[PDB]
TrEMBL record, chain A:
PANTHER family given in the database record: GLUCOSAMINE--FRUCTOSE-6-PHOSPHATE AMINOTRANSFERASE, ISOMERIZING, GLUCOSAMINE-FRUCTOSE-6-PHOSPHATE AMINOTRANSFERASE
Keyword rRNA-binding: no
Stated name of the protein: Inner membrane protein
UniProt superkingdom: Bacteria
Top-level taxonomy: Bacteria, Pseudomonadati, Pseudomonadota, Gammaproteobacteria, Enterobacterales
Keywords per UniProt: Repeat
GO BP term (any one): fructose 6-phosphate metabolic process
Signal sequence range: none
Domain SIS: 28-163
């Protein structure tokens, strides 16, 4: 299977990114600090947008700045003019979209600093970038690399502003490395689980993914890749939004895949109620019930880096269904 | 069809709002200017969220401040800690979601000023509101009234900060009033159009709505209501996002409803291209070709207030299809 060769290599591609000197990111972090950037704006579509969503919190924290995430069209002339000076970063799994290009140029015209994050070099969006921060993918991993690239930028900014010492830099790299090394085990487990529940998930009309706000980008990306690969409806919701609009988001024909990184009364309760109506409930987490449907796996569960783990079972469904 | 009595009265409800003295809006405008608020954050879900999307631009311009629109869960403590002092406005068609309430309480605990925009009074979200800006509903119009409520707040802020003189004020009200007076004719035209294209839309697997950025809130809200009423898949996309992700958002079995406020080469091209593959293409605008499928209608097309017009045809499909 061609999709496995891509998944099996992702952990190592991620590890390699930990041992590359990123002169490009440091030049960006330097300009950011010195040229009075007041907020970071991440813009793109689909996977790129989901990567930005997934990396937002980590970026806010380490950059010590607001971090906005939106679709390129939300960045019109007026929004860009009202905003304080920002580093607008256009993200793309490819060479960039017309919308993203246009957005970067509008920002650059008003005086904002721009950067490109393409999956290839040269990219079209590089034309509008003051700093090319290309995601290193040489010649599946896309989402993962995009997320780590954004986090590395956050760390570059932290260090340039002298808010990241050796002990912090190391602790972080150790945590990232620990999670990456545990992915292969999760890939194998995910395959077993994905194969065990293939018949049921196919036999559902549509599929709904949900989880805590901390994994919103995860469920969004999961939903997109399943729609894109399996060709049937799949949507990803933040848990409370799903509850609030449950009847527009689910019926007896639907299947639910829920992300349970930690015990949660409210999520357990939803699972209990839907369970009475349908047997198509699949939960993923370290302490979920070990029936045949769930994926009970000892996730590293790093508060910042578990995002690299929880997308894997969802990607596996794309590969085996 | 109780949905009509609702729609028929909406234009009159909106006109009334223009002549109401809104001390509540003014107090909020005064408090904003005096307590160093640096941005407005509109938060909510569904129709409330869409209403926020629809009014964003108008608010930015007249408040002269950045305006964010996001779901409550996005407003976490770390985001509220990083943000400059803001006016967080919690919006809920009903009394409020626990999510919006929690967001407001989180903003309040860190020093941000809060405001509530519910459709009822008292509303659950009023509990965490420094300023209750209730949408004046009395006991369909919800989305219209919420968008207007938000726009009146912006005018109140512009007034307090002496950036909206009498002539500008009077001019903006004329425009709003002209759009509102033209809605009844649009309701009659929409019903006729919806009845003419009834069967075709019923026989489509799923419906996709698209439009320019300036009407994103419109296709989002229209999508949600049609899904909620017709009980089948409906999604609203911004035009270019739609082109960029076409194969995941559309196929031969799909029906497209497109909003064409003005002539656009790219939209025409898309319609021509898709037209070869499916006849289920429906365009809404003043200059759309007058075949049976499209809704060619003389919209007022106000660059700011056309939002009150283009949602009507989509709302009419909810009322007459099922």
């Amino acid at each position: 299977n061609l999709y496995f060769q891509g998944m099996n290599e992702t952990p190592l591609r991620l590890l390699e990114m930990l041992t590359q000197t990123r002169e490009d990111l440091w030049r960006a972090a330097q300009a950011l600090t010195e040229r009075g950037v007041t907020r970071i704006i991440l813009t793109g579509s689909g996977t790129s947008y989901h990567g930005a969503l997934t990396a937002r919190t980590f970026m806010q924290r380490w950059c010590a700045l607001p971090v906005d995430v939106c679709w390129p069209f939300m960045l019109d002339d007026e929004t860009l003019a009202r905003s304080g000076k920002a580093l607008v970063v256009g993200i793309s799994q490819g060479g960039g979209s017309l919308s993203t290009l246009a957005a970067m140029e509008r920002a650059r015209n008003v005086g904002h600093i721009t950067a490109s994050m393409a999956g290839v070099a040269p990219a079209t969006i590089d034309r509008a970038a003051d700093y090319i921060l290309t995601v290193p993918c040489g010649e599946t991993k896309g989402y993962h690399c995009t997320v780590l690239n954004l986090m590395l930028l956050a760390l570059a900014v932290a260090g340039q502003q002298q808010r990241l010492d050796g002990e912090q830099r190391r602790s972080l790299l150790l945590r990232m490395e620990k999670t990456f090394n545990h992915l292969p085990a999760l890939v194998t487990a995910s395959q077993a689980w994905a194969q065990t529940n293939a018949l049921a998930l196919r036999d559902s009309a549509d599929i709904r993914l949900t989880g805590p706000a901390t994994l919103f980008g995860t469920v969004q990306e999961g939903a997109l890749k399943m729609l894109e690969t399996l060709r049937c409806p799949v949507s990803g919701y933040e848990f409370e939004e799903f509850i609030h609009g449950i009847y527009n988001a689910f019926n007896a024909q639907s299947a639910l895949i829920m992300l349970d990184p930690q015990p949660d009364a409210r999520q357990d309760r939803l699972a209990q109620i839907l369970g009475e109506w349908t047997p198509s409930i699949y939960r993923i987490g370290p302490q979920v019930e070990n029936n045949g449907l769930n994926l009970n796996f000892p996730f590293v569960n790093d508060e910042d880096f578990a995002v690299f783990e929880y997308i894997i079972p969802l990607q596996m469904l794309c590969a085996i269904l």
